[PDB]
Amino acid sequence: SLLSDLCNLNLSESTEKIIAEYIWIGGSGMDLRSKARTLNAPVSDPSKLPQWNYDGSSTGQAPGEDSEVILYPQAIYKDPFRRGNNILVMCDAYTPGGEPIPTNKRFDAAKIFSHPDVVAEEPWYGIEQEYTLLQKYCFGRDIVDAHYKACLYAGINISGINGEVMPGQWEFQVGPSVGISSGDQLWMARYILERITEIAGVVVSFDPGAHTNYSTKSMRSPASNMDPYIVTSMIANTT
Amino acid sequence: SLLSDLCNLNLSESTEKIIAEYIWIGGSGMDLRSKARTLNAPVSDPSKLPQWNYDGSSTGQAPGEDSEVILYPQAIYKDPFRRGNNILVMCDAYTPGGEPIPTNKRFDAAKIFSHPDVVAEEPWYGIEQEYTLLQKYCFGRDIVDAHYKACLYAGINISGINGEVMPGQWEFQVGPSVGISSGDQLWMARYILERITEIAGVVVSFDPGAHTNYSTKSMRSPASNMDPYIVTSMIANTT
Amino acid sequence: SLLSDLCNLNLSESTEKIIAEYIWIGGSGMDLRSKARTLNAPVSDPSKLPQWNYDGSSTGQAPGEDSEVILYPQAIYKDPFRRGNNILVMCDAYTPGGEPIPTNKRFDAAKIFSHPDVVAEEPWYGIEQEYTLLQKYCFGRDIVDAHYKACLYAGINISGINGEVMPGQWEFQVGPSVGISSGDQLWMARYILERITEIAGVVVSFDPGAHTNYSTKSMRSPASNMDPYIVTSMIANTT
Amino acid sequence: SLLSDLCNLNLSESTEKIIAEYIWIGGSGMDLRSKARTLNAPVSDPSKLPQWNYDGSSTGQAPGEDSEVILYPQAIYKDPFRRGNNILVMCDAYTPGGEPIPTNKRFDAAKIFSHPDVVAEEPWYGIEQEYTLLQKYCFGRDIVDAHYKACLYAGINISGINGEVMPGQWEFQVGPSVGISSGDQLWMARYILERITEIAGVVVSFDPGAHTNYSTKSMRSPASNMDPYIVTSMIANTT
Amino acid sequence: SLLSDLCNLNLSESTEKIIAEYIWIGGSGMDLRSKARTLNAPVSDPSKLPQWNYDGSSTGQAPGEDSEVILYPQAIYKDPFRRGNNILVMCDAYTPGGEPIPTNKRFDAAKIFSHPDVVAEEPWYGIEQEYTLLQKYCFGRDIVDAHYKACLYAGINISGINGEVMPGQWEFQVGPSVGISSGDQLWMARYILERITEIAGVVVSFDPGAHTNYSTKSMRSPASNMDPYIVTSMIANTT
């Protein structure tokens, strides 16, 4: 009863102001980090949403002398937790000057997908990621049901889950999305899980496979902890 | 308060997407299994539902070299746990090629009920199933009341419950559903109980009797853990 | 949070069906029993409700060779727990053939009240019932407040309660109702208490008195565990 | 979750009936106690409510041979707990025959305030009541906030609270009300606190000084556990 | 369930009365204190709100012989813990006669910001305060989420928060506001945190560096536990 009467205030009636949560990829390459900011009005097109920046030296992606790391918005989705107009934004990391940071891995994938052949093919990607739940075939079904509902609420194109033979570990399927967004969504969806898991007190382990589905218009008419952009771009170049 | 604010989000306002839960009889013949999937729009006609697949070797119905088992949609009911428009779909198991799996037991019952004599008789079937609740005449009445409410919410034609002399064990009845659907409903209703029981932390035992009552147009003018299709077809052939 | 999200579903929106809880007096003469049934549509007139049956041998009111006992619907009230259209029904016990069961004590009271002199007098009855609460002037006050509100919700003509000198015990006063219905209501209201007490985990003791108030048209212009029909009929035809 | 789903039923939709809580000063002079009754329709004028009574022998204000104590409704305010239309009534004690009971202390104050000079002056009274909370400047702020909101809900003209230097003990100011009503309100306000405190499981101690503020039309143009009527009437006679 | 059904009553429907909470800086200079009062109608312009006063001897800002300390309304904001129309008011401390109290630090800041040069420059201030949570980059995120939501609800122009490297300590950045109001808001916002922390049972420590951002119209076209009015006025005089 205590402290939960808050966190649900319909701030829209009182203030037109909104919050945006900046999500980016941690320096280690297997960690994800995020922190908040306030915007005067809701923003749905990532072009309108202004850039921002942070201190990267503490994140292990730049030395202390030059720690500032820039961030440009890439994906805009609705926030599942702060159920108002509040939005989550998926943004990538850039070192000062405009060049992509070595841990970005997004700039190359985007420039590959920008090629006319790839966009003409319009590839569809579905990555089959399996995870496990640990204490701090078809335990805690509430966690997975909440995750599924939240992912469909945000805008993640997730197509289905299942139980599996190993005790307590599951798998969820992300549906075919238009181009690199597919890979994007994976990371974003992954983020949501931890927060929901943080509500319960469980530990989510993604440690190892990740089956990749590929399709193109020319025909229709991997590790779990691996960056989807790496496999999504690599399979496109190969095919 | 935690994690229960989720699982109730009215996803209908945000997305037109729906969840569909695929439920089918397990390989052992007494086990019942399911896993989830996502559909673009709700569909209440079982014809329009696409088929789907799964792995049967892990479920004890395939040796392993040929593990894939097919699924055809048979029954559509509303989901009580996810509410909204979410639907449970009852499906039967078929080995590749279209032949029924040995543990199916539905194809023969359906072909018997498809006989013109049986459909002309229009049989009405009422099953008398009793169960017991264990730790993990007229204890935990909340469980049975919740089960009754959920069953009437879904569409199960359940006609009533009662207490009995043995401590804590009850019995519920399925009314006059049209033909083989009656048998269908039994299995489906059984499923719901476990999930509701899964909410509480009890174990449901159906171990042994299930009285079977039959009626047709001609006259009007069994074990608890036994397949309703077997009894509903055997008595139909006898009469 | 768990399992209480159910038991409150507005089943009226989904299905037009209703539950009815058939209520009768136990074989011991002071125990009260009931079990559920389903009706296609809500009905507020006790005449329309069909009769029903049960097993009396397990209830100690008939030997095993001839155990079936009949039930006729007598009183219709709204259900306090199943807050929809669901209705409780108070019914009396009859041995097969149409004769009243020895533990009925109701047919004779009804036939006495059917006398033209009695209906001309239009007697008003208020029975003063005292009870006590045990662990399993003016402790568990929420229990008695809930009882008061639920009884007012159902249709029971109750009027006022209080605490008294002995610790923890209360008493509730039933308003003057039209004839035998008064006695009826007592029993029905009695039932509600146990269910509400069943929600909490208390023991309700009715062991001893029961003050009876009598009034007729002529003038205006007992133990707690005693059947109200006995005192209501005995105090009548005597004044 | 259990037993609290009740006690909030909107009984107004079902029944036009209402509950009414008859409140009177205990025999010892330092106790305020009450018991319930039912009324056919809500009434906001204290004249219309019926005369009533109770048994006073156990209350220590009348011997056993002549125990009945007579009660007339005086003040009507809305109930904070049984929300909706339910009303608390503040009533005084009368020895049978029309004479005020020795512990009443209201008849003399009312007859003093009925004097033309006092009503012409139209005195305003502000009583400074302080209390302490015990285990069973500016601890359990929820209790005092609830008391504040409930008092403003009912109609008690309370003007404010604050903390104080002594650990955990507060004080509240009752605003200037029209004549003797001021004193009236103080008593009822006290009552509400215990009930709210009864929700929590605390002990409210009023043991000692209630500062009294006096004002009239002529100029504008005491123990905490002492009866407000005594000080309110005494200061009026002195001034 | 208990006592939380209260504290949320929509007092607006019943009574037009409102509560107003008077907040003033404590005598020690590092403590902030408050107490409640009642108003006939809601007040949004601080001019309309009448002055008030309190006892300062217990607050350590005046000796016992002359303890009374006056208060004038300065800032009006909406209340998060009482919702509806209820308001908080931030007021400054003055010794009797109209001169500012030595611990005020507000009159001098106001007279400096009232200078024509400063108001012409229209300075924008953003103070960056960090805090730590103790038992009684980017633990208990519910507390900080609730604080952020409450601050945006009240009217505090806070710009965003973040996690940091040291375990459990955060920082919140308040956006630019029109002149001295900026500093004002800081204090007010700080207050809210403790109350929310009071809901949970944590200890908020502000012990240190409050980064100060300064801007004016001329160019556009500090300890954490230090008074914002001191720094916001000192930097204005310097620049």
Residue numbers in the entry:
A (entry chain D), B (entry chain C), C (entry chain A), D (entry chain B), E (entry chain E): 2 to 137, 158 to 159, 167 to 236, 247 to 259, 334 to 351
The authors write:
Unexpected, CsGSIbPen exhibited high conformational heterogeneity and 3D particles classification generated three similar structures with the r.m.s.d. ranging from 0.6 to 0.8 Å, differing in a few peripheral regions. The most striking difference between CsGSIbPen and CsGSIbDec is that several regions are missing in the electron density map of all three classifications of CsGSIbPen particles, with only 229–255 out of 356 residues electron densities in presence. As a result, CsGSIbPen demonstrated a decagram-shaped density map with a few regions missing at the rim, in sharp contrast to a pentagon-shaped map yielded by the CsGSIbDec particles. For the 229–255 residues that show clear density in CsGSIbPen particles, the conformation of each subunit in three CsGSIbPen EM structures, as well as the arrangement pattern, closely resembles that of the CsGSIbDec, as evidenced by r.m.s.d. in the range of 0.7–1.0 Å. The density-missing regions include the segments around residues of 110–117, 140–166, and 260–334, among which, the fragment around residues 260–334 is a major component making up an integral catalytic site, while the segment of residues 140–166 comprising of the two gear teeth is responsible for ring-ring interaction (–4d).
Decades of studies have established a striking notion that all three classes of GS enzymes, despite of dramatic differences in amino acid sequences and protein sizes, share quaternary geometry in dihedral symmetry assembled with two oligomeric rings. Considering that the active sites of GS are located at the clefts formed between two neighboring protomers within the same ring and distal to the ring-ring interface, each isolated GS subcomplex ring holds multiple integral catalytic sites. Cryo-EM structure determination of GS in both the catalytically active and inactive assembly states allows us to reveal an unanticipated self-assembly-induced disorder-order transition paradigm, in which the remote interactions between two subcomplex entities significantly rigidify the otherwise structurally fluctuating active sites, thereby regulating activity.
